[PDB]
Amino acid sequence: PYNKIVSHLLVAEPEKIYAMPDPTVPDSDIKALTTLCDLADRELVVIIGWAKHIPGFSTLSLADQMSLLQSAWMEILILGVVYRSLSFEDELVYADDYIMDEDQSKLAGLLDLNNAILQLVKKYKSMKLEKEEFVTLKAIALANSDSMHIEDVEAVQKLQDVLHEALQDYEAGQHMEDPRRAGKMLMTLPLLRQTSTKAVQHFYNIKLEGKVPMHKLFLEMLEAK
């Protein structure tokens, strides 16, 4: 009974995805990394479809649309992993069929990064993040990507205002008991930004390494300047 934009985004949420690890291969880091890298590539095709459904996004120019995505794609991926891990404890639900724990992570060579993503989880758990807030925040992160290659700054600045206004309206209606709720949600964007660039640079270290196979899109987004 709330906001149009919020409703629109709830409905536009992508269909659940699966890692589908390979039974034939013995657990190993290269397997784990090859898995996440495989999932991510698929999730990216999903995200690109989803982005086109964010109110106002398609309105921008292809160039701008592209810039935002090459800039915020990893934040979006992480927000999904984060939201899914809300019901769990000290675990990261990269997918229903692929949940990582402390040991799995370190053995995958990602205990420092995943330990950070759990920092976000902890914050969102203590706030009692709702799906409505999650989908809106995800769109805001994309619109507030801070890409340096934007063409029509005003147009993107408008996309941001629409999304931000939706978040404020939503919070004003459902959480009147806390006049700062919307602000606290926005104040979590920095940690998301930080964790997101960390993850990207790291998986770039792998791509350059070459011990793990990656698909055309995922890689395209990674070489993305």
Partner: peptide, 10 residues
Amino acid sequence: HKILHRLLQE
């Protein structure tokens, strides 16, 4: 910058 261009172009 091609793939992403293709998907968005649909």
